[PDB]
Amino acid sequence: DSEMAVFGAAAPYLRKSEKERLEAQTRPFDLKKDVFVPDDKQEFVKAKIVSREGGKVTAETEYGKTVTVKEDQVMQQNPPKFDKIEDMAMLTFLHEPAVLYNLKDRYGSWMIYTYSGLFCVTVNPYKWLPVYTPEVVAAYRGKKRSEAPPHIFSISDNAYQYMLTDRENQSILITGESGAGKTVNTKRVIQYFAVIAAIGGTLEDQIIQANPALEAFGNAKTVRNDNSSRFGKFIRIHFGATGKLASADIETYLLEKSRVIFQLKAERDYHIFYQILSNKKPELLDMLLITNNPYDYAFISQGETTVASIDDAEELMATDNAFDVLGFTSEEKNSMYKLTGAIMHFGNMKFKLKQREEQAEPDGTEEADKSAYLMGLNSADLLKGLCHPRVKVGNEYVTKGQNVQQVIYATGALAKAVYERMFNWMVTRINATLETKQPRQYFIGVLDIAGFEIFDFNSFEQLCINFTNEKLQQFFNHHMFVLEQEEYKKEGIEWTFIDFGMDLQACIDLIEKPMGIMSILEEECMFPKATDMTFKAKLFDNHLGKSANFQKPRNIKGKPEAHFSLIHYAGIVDYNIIGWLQKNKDPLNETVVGLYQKSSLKLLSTLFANYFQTVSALHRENLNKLMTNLRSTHPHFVRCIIPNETKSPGVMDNPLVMHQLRCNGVLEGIRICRKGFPNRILYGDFRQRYRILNPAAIPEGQFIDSRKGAEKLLSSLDIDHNQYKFGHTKVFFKAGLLGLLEEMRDERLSRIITRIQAQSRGVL
Ligand SMILES: Nc1ncnc2c1ncn2[C@@H]1O[C@H](COP(=O)(O)OP(=O)(O)O)[C@@H](O)[C@H]1O
Ligand SMILES: [Mg+2]
C-alpha cells in the first residue's frame, strides 16, 4: 500500500487497506434503524429498529432474534465512516457498545492498539505479530499521534517528544489484569528507546538484556498467565539534555517470596529452577549436586513442573547469556546457581522427633551435607543451629526446643529469605552496571505493577498486589477526573464540575489508614498472644458494617474456605486469612543467619551482611514513595485488556472485556476528553509557536500584552471561537483544535519555503 509503504510488512496490521478505507463508505446503513440493544449472553448486539411502540421499541437483532426494549435503553450505532477509527474520542456516538464494538472490529483484523483520547487501549493477541520489527521503530520515529496509527511505539515517541518540549519527566504507566500484556508492552517501550539510541557503547543492549535476567528469577507460570511476572517493576530510563540515552535504573517493589516453597496446583515455581533442570546442562548439574528429575525436590515438585508453552532448554541459554551481557563475572554467575541449587536440596532435609523428648533432630544428613557445601557451611553447625536456635534475652541466651513442625517452617523461612535477598541483590548488581555516568537531566519511568489477581486461595500475597492496583487506578482517577477538573476552576474556565463516579478512596481507606486491614496486621505483631482467629475477630469487630467495602465471605461450594470478601475495584475477592501474622513479619533463626554471615561464599556473606519493620510497613512506605514520585511527572497511560481467558487468539468474550472497560473507567476517560479541554498552552509559548500563522495580527516590535495578543490572534484565524477558552494563565483548547492549528502551521510554513525558492529564482 502506497501511503503505508513506510511500515512495510506490518502495514496490514496498522491500517485497513486503501480498498477498505473507501469500500467502508459504501456500506448499507439506515441511521433511523441501526442501533445497539442489550442482551444477556453478550452485552450488546447490533440491531435494526422494526417499529416504535410509544416509550417501547421493537427491533430485529443481527442474529435475527426479535427483541423488545424500552426507548431510553436503545442506543444508536456509530455510522459506518467511523468503522475501526484510530482515536475513539472522535466518534459521533460514544457509549458502552460503541467502544466495545469498535475494539472488537479493530481486533477482528488484529489491529490491536487503539487510542482513547489521552490514553490507549491494548487488546491482547495470543499470536505474535510482525508489527514490532525494528524497521517499524524507524518508521515511527518523530511522528505525531495524529499522523501514525496507534501503536506502543507511538506512545513512547509521543512521551519522548513531550519530554523534549516541556522539559518535564515522563512516566508511562501500563495497567491491566494478569495476562493482559503489561510486561511485553514494557519490553516494547524499552525496545523502542534502545533501537532509537542504537541508530542515533553497549548500554542500549544492556537495558534490553536487563529484562531476561530478571524474568528468569522473577516470573513463574500461574493459571492466569504462563509468564506471570510476580514482581512490580518501575524502569527509570534516563536521558541527557541532548535527548540521547544516558543511563537506566531498575526498581522492583515486592516479590512473591512464598512461591519458592509453596505452589498451588496448575502453577510453577520461578523459571530459574526449572530451566536449570530441563536443559540437562552438565556444566551446572555436575557443579550443583542435583539429579535431573524435578519430582524429588519437595519445594519444586508440587503443582506442575512443565508446560507446553515454554522451551526451558533454550531459555536457560538466553538467561545465562543475559547475565554475561550485564557483566556478571563467571564465579558470581556460578555462585547464584549454587544458592538456587541449595534451595532445591534445602526442602528435602528430613527431621524426626526424638521419641520422648518432643524435640526434632535430623533424620538423615546427606541433603544437609549437599546444601552446606554449596552455601559454604559446617554441616554439623547448620543442623545444630537449625534445631537449637540461640535467642538473645539480655545477659543470657535461652535455647529453644524446636518441634518437628516448626523446624520445617524454619527451613522454609530461611529458603524464602536467601532467595529474596539474592533477587534484591541482583537488581542492585544490574543498576550498578547500568549507571554509565553519562550526562543526565530527565527521566522516563515505565511501570508494570503485577496485575490484579483472583486465584482460589487469596492469601496475603494477593492483598499486597491488589492494593497496588487499587492505588494505581486511584492515581489514574485522580489525574484524569479530579486534577483535570481542578485546573479548570483554578484557571477560571466557565466550567461545571462533572461527577464521573470513578473514585476508590473509600476502599483504600479500608487498607491504608491506621485502623485499616494493613494496620491491624501491624498492631497484632506487637502481641505475643495474638493468633489469626483472634486477628480475624478484630477485623470483623472493627469493620463489619463500619465500611461498605468489607463484607462477610461468600463461600461457594468447592472453593476453599475464605474468611472475608473485599469489594476491590475490579471484583469481589474472597481472601483466606490463615497464617498472615507470621507472613507479615517472618522472623529468621538468628543463629543460622549467623552461619550465613560466616559462609565462605562471598555472595551469601554479602546477602545477609547487616541483617522492627513489617512486610506491610516497608511495602506501604515504598508504594507511597512511588506515587509521590509519579505525581511529579506527566503520565502517559496505556490500558491493557485481556480479551479471552482461554488464551486462544482472536476470539473475544464480550462480558469479560466489558467488565474490564467499565472498571478501568475507559468510557469516562474518553468523555472527559470530549467534554473538557484536553490541550492547553501557556500564552508565552502560544505567541512563540503560533504567531507564524498570522504575523500581521500582532507585530512583534510593537508592544502588546501576551494575553491580549493571543486574544487578538485567534479571532483572525477564521476558526470556531467556541472551540477554545481563555484562562488566567493559559489558553485552553477542545479536542481537535490543537491539531487544526498544527495543520495550519505546517501548511503556511511550506508555502513560505516555496516563496523562498521563488525569490531565489527571482533575484538570479
Ligand atoms: N503484544 C503481544 N503480542 C503477542 N502475544 C502477546 C502480547 N501480549 C501478550 N501476549 C501473550 O500473552 C502472554 C502474557 O503476556 P505477559 O508479557 O506475561 O503480560 P503480563 O505480564 O501482563 O501477563 C504472553 O506470554 C503471550 O502469550
Ligand atoms: Mg507482567
Specify burial of residue 708 (Cβ count, 10 A radius: 0-12, 13-18, 19+): exposed
Q: Which of 111, 112, 126, 215 to mutate to test the pocket of ligand 1 (most atoms within 8 A of CB)?
A: 126
Cα–Cα distance for residue pair 706/177, rounded to 1 Å: 47
Quick check: is 228 catalytic?
yes
Q: Indicate the helix (H) or strand (E) that contains 351.
A: strand 351-353
714 occurs within a structural domain: yes
What is the grid cell recorded at 415? 529458603
What is the grid cell recorded at 593? 543467619
Q: Which of 238, 264, 176, 234 is nearest to 626 (CA)?
A: 234
What is the grid cell recorded at 615? 512486610
The SS3 call for residue 681 is strand
Estimate the share of the chain in helix, then strand, then coil, as percent rounded to the nearest 5: 45, 15, 40
- Check if the beta carbon of residue 177 is closer than 8 Å to that of residue 642: yes
Q: Between β-strands 66-70 and 351-353, what pairing exists: parallel, antiparallel or unpaired?
A: unpaired
396 occurs within a structural domain: no
End-to-end CA distance of the chain: 41
Give the distance (Å) from ligand 1 centre to CA of residue 313.
20
Give the distance (Å) from ligand 1 centre to CA of residue 310.
13
744 occurs within a structural domain: yes
* CATH, residue 718: 1.20.5.4820
Q: Which of 274, 277, 347 is nearest to 307 (CA)?
A: 274
Cα–Cα distance for residue pair 681/738, rounded to 1 Å: 10
The residues that bridge with 680 in the sheet, in sequence order, are 732
Q: For residue 182, which amino acid is it?
A: K
114 occurs within a structural domain: no
Give the distance (Å) from ligand 2 centre to CA of residue 565.
25
List b or e across 624-644, with b for residues whose CB sees 16 or more CB atoms inside 10 angstroms: eebeebbeebebbbbbbbbbb
Q: Which of 129, 191, 225 to mutate to test the pocket of ligand 1 (most atoms within 8 A of CB)?
A: 225
Cα–Cα distance for residue pair 285/7, rounded to 1 Å: 47
Is 291 annotated to bind ligand? no
Q: At what angle do helices 203-218 and 182-199 cross, to 10 degrees?
A: 160
Cα–Cα distance for residue pair 96/666, rounded to 1 Å: 10
What is the grid cell recorded at 720? 470556531
Please, which experimental method was used?
Answer: cryo-EM
Q: How far is CA 577 from the centre of its chain?
A: 26
741 occurs within a structural domain: yes
In this structure, the dihedral spanned by the alpha carbons of residues 359, 363, 365 and 368, taken in order and rounded to 10 degrees, is -70
Q: For residue 466, which amino acid is it?
A: N
What are the two backbone dihedrals, phi and then psi, of residue 67, each rounded to the nearest 5 degrees?
Answer: -135, 145
691 occurs within a structural domain: yes
Total domains in the fold of the chain: 1
Q: Which of 107, 154, 129, 262 is nearest to 644 (CA)?
A: 107
Contacts of 324 (CB under 8 A, 6+ apart): 333
Whose cell is 496448575? That residue is 266
- Check if the beta carbon of residue 655 is closer than 8 Å to that of residue 663: no
Is 445 annotated to bind ligand? no
List b or e across 390-429, with b for residues whose CB sees 16 or more CB atoms inside 10 angstroms: eeeeeeeeeeeebebeebbebbbbbbbbbbbbbbeebbeb
Cα–Cα distance for residue pair 340/552, rounded to 1 Å: 41
Which alpha helices (H) appear in 491-608, and where do they start and end? Answer: 505-511, 517-523, 532-543, 580-583, 590-596, 602-607
What is the CB neighbour count within 10 angstroms for residue 92?
A: 13
List b or e across 162-196, with b for residues whose CB sees 16 or more CB atoms inside 10 angstroms: ebeeeeebbbbbbbbbbbbbbbbbbbbbbbbbbbb
Cα–Cα distance for residue pair 89/121, rounded to 1 Å: 12
Q: Which of 375, 354, 378 is nearest to 365 (CA)?
A: 378
708 occurs within a structural domain: yes
Half-sphere exposure of 248 (CA within 13 A, CB side): 29
Check if 180 has its Cβ closer than 6 Å to any atom of ligand 1: yes
537 occurs within a structural domain: no
In this structure, the dihedral spanned by the alpha carbons of residues 55, 60, 63 and 65, taken in order and rounded to 10 degrees, is 80
Q: Which domain holds residue 745?
A: 680-763
Cα–Cα distance for residue pair 463/93, rounded to 1 Å: 39
Contacts of 493 (CB under 8 A, 6+ apart): 677, 725, 727, 732
- Check if the beta carbon of residue 344 is closer than 8 Å to that of residue 371: no
- Check if the beta carbon of residue 654 is closer than 8 Å to that of residue 44: yes
The residues that bridge with 48 in the sheet, in sequence order, are 34, 60
What is the grid cell recorded at 547? 465500611
Atom of ligand 1 nearest to the CA of 640: 22
The residues that bridge with 172 in the sheet, in sequence order, are 446, 636
The DSSP 8-state label assigned to residue 117 in this structure reads S
The residues that bridge with 556 in the sheet, in sequence order, are none
- Check if the beta carbon of residue 491 is closer than 8 Å to that of residue 729: yes
Cα–Cα distance for residue pair 679/477, rounded to 1 Å: 18
Cα–Cα distance for residue pair 306/295, rounded to 1 Å: 11
What is the CB neighbour count within 10 angstroms for residue 77?
A: 21
Quick check: is 762 catalytic?
no
Cα–Cα distance for residue pair 439/461, rounded to 1 Å: 40
E-strand ranges in 416-529 read 442-448
Q: Between β-strands 113-115 and 75-76, what pairing exists: parallel, antiparallel or unpaired?
A: unpaired
Quick check: is 555 catalytic?
no
Cα–Cα distance for residue pair 90/84, rounded to 1 Å: 11
Q: Which of 340, 270, 365 is nearest to 607 (CA)?
A: 340
Quick check: is 225 catalytic?
yes
Cα–Cα distance for residue pair 735/91, rounded to 1 Å: 12
What is the grid cell recorded at 364? 538423615
- Check if the beta carbon of residue 273 is closer than 8 Å to that of residue 461: no
Q: Among 229, 305, 371, 664, which one carries the catalytic annotation?
A: 229
Whose cell is 533432630? That residue is 361
Which ligand lies nearest the alpha carbon of 113? 1
The residues that bridge with 238 in the sheet, in sequence order, are 247, 443
The residues that bridge with 439 in the sheet, in sequence order, are none
- Check if the beta carbon of residue 567 is closer than 8 Å to that of residue 551: yes
- Check if the beta carbon of residue 232 is closer than 8 Å to that of residue 445: no
Specify burial of residue 753 (Cβ count, 10 A radius: 0-12, 13-18, 19+): exposed
Check if 183 has its Cβ closer than 6 Å to any atom of ligand 1: yes
Specify burial of residue 470 (Cβ count, 10 A radius: 0-12, 13-18, 19+): buried
The SS3 call for residue 233 is strand
Cα–Cα distance for residue pair 401/388, rounded to 1 Å: 6
What is the grid cell recorded at 187? 519490553
- Check if the beta carbon of residue 301 is closer than 8 Å to that of residue 245: no
- Check if the beta carbon of residue 276 is closer than 8 Å to that of residue 284: yes
Give the distance (Å) from ligand 2 centre to CA of residue 225.
9
Which ligand lies nearest the alpha carbon of 448? 2
Rg (CA), the chain: 30
Cα–Cα distance for residue pair 239/118, rounded to 1 Å: 24
List b or e across 12-34, with b for residues whose CB sees 16 or more CB atoms inside 10 angstroms: bbbbbeeeeeeeeeeeeeeeeeb
